[PDB]
Amino acid sequence: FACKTANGTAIPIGGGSANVYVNLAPVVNVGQNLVVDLSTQIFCHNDYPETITDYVTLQRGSAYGGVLSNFSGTVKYSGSSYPFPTTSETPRVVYNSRTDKPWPVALYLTPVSSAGGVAIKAGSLIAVLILRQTNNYNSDDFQFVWNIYANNDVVVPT
Numbered sequence: 001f002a003c004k005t006a007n008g009t010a011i012p013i014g015g016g017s018a019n020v021y022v023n024l025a026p027v028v029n030v031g032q033n034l035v036v037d038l039s040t041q042i043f044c045h046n047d048y049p050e051t052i053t054d055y056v057t058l059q060r061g062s063a064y065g066g067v068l069s070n071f072s073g074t075v076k077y078s079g080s081s082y083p084f085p086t087t088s089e090t091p092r093v094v095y096n097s098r099t100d101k102p103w104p105v106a107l108y109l110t111p112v113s114s115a116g117g118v119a120i121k122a123g124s125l126i127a128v129l130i131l132r133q134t135n136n137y138n139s140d141d142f143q144f145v146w147n148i149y150a151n152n153d154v155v156v157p158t
Helices: none
Strands: 002-005 016-022 042-045 055-063 071-077 105-111 117-120 125-133 143-150 154-156
Antiparallel strands (some): 117 154
């Protein structure tokens, strides 16, 4: 009952943190719709599909870099739509899949007014999300930190 990134950071049960690296469109102008799709960057797996119910929730999310400043939008989780960075957590979501399934999260951050040129830097921390692993059996509710990094630098032609 653990989760892994697209780079290869598998976080075992017990809590931990990974560094996810997401590539965003390097061209995003004021009024665009940029989406940090993490469903292609993060994947969770329930190694105990019979022993543990597959359940996950984003505890909280935080924004940084140009994401919090040059960008603005919202954050999405399993088809949710809440402000980013959030103030609490996400809806209750069950994984109906006993295999490595992508983590349905996306940070919709779009260039405000104060966006222009290099807005996102590759290798730089852009956000921090934390996922709650909780189950009905063991109740080993550990949480995994998902440091969202830019896989690619983004420029705002505006």
